[PDB]
Amino acid sequence: GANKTVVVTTILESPYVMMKKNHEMLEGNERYEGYCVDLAAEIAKHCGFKYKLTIVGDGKYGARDADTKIWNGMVGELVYGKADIAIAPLTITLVREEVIDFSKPFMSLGISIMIKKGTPIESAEDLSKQTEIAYGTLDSGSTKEFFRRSKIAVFDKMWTYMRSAEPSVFVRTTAEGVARVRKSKGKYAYLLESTMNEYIEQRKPCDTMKVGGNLDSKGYGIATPKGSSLGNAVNLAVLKLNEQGLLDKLKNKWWYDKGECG
Amino acid sequence: GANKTVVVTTILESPYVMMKKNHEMLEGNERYEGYCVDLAAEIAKHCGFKYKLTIVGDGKYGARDADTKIWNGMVGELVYGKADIAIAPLTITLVREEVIDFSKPFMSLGISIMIKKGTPIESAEDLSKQTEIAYGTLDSGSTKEFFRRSKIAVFDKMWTYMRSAEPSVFVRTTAEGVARVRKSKGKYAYLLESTMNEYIEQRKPCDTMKVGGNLDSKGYGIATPKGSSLGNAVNLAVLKLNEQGLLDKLKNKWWYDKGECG
Numbered sequence A, B: 001g002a003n004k005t006v007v008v009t010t011i012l013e014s015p016y017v018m019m020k021k022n023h024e025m026l027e028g029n030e031r032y033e034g035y036c037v038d039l040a041a042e043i044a045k046h047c048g049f050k051y052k053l054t055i056v057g058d059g060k061y062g063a064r065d066a067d068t069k070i071w072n073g074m075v076g077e078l079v080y081g082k083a084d085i086a087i088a089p090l091t092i093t094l095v096r097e098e099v100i101d102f103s104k105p106f107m108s109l110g111i112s113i114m115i116k117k118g119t120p121i122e123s124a125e126d127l128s129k130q131t132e133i134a135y136g137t138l139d140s141g142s143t144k145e146f147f148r149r150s151k152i153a154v155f156d157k158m159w160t161y162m163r164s165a166e167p168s169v170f171v172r173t174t175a176e177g178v179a180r181v182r183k184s185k186g187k188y189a190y191l192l193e194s195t196m197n198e199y200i201e202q203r204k205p206c207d208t209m210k211v212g213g214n215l216d217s218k219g220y221g222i223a224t225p226k227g228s229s230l231g232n233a234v235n236l237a238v239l240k241l242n243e244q245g246l247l248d249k250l251k252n253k254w255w256y257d258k259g260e261c262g
Ligand SMILES: N[C@H](Cc1nsnc1O)C(=O)O
Pocket: A061, A062, A089, A090, A091, A092, A137, A138, A140, A141, A142, A143, A144, A174, A191, A192, A193, A196
């Protein structure tokens, strides 16, 4: 049929998608700003379509509920036809690639450790060999899944501790993880993707630090329902943007150009 | 029909595919060793197929000849049905994705600068602002194409110089680029992918160094003829291997576990 407005599912995660300071006075797509808001614009331009940005209802990235077997988050929105595409920091994983399509990565990343400055921790091994400093991850997504599945000694040890720790060491959003690290006087370390970690490191009150090397290497991809016609065009659009140096500039724009820590 | 031996096209590039020291006494796939030889084995195991490794005839990665319009190298082998899959450090690019399929990346990289230790160069800008130290790239592939296409000031300036430099600053293979840097007393710098650069840095006589940050960010993908049935299984295989930490171990195995520079 004729062209139709493409429904984009995304998530409120700084600095990918954030509410403009004056969003209360705006409406539609203009309420949002950020790396993925800019990328969405570029993709639509190159693919030739108009779109409506919609924040995922449950605020989740996407996981298959072990109970109901129903996919939640942005992945779910695609799987059940609620949205036509996902433009956000959605990590490309095996379980997800089995149910939806992913474009080649538009950004790279790896699980990392975030500590309050001064915390005596330099690695995952360090965390696994102590109990005074608690640690956790987002309550769902590629990181939690990484630990739940891991057969690597150190990571499995970490998972055994995290899953049974009481009170919970898991958080609902990255913002909550960051807040916990900042208010825990170094007694809480947060495991999240290097990209968000690096961003937060340049935000006031500049009291957090990324320590150690990444535990893995992967990337974010633009997702579409399995078999979607839009998939191929989006993929080529992503590659073109990267080769034009456009993605690199968007990265600098939202991460370092306006860092608040010097 | 029934299963058939899968023809794998690859390229002799250390440490991805190298001739074993005693290859002269061996035959078939057993003549070769390296990261991609190991990856090929893992992919075949996970995808359930047997294969024959064959070194690309022209020794090229793959480019569309401006004259004949014919694709050469490994890309050509796929495009014309000479091979069923390419397992090598083949860079995922737009022009290539338009003619063949690529799995999600199995390794990340970026164009980098290789200098003989001591050379007064720390960046691409540095190179572009001087003439005493000549510089070049492989005579074909994603790096040369990066410069030929680039609209970025500094890189276009570099391309203008390189393309017209006499004698040629381009080389036929990475090995030739490395040799030129090592024998040029610092008067030649080589532009190649960070992965090969980092590998060479840990090889005797340990006289080369990677300097500056990468000029871009991209990845290597396993390639198959456009629409090939093998594509989907290979892609999932790649993701599974990465999530098992297998790719990380292969990287260490062939890059650092046996570095000869400490
Ligand atoms: N990219 C998210 C996971 C994530 N983002 S920041 N910290 C995390 O664990 C996913 O795709 O699940």
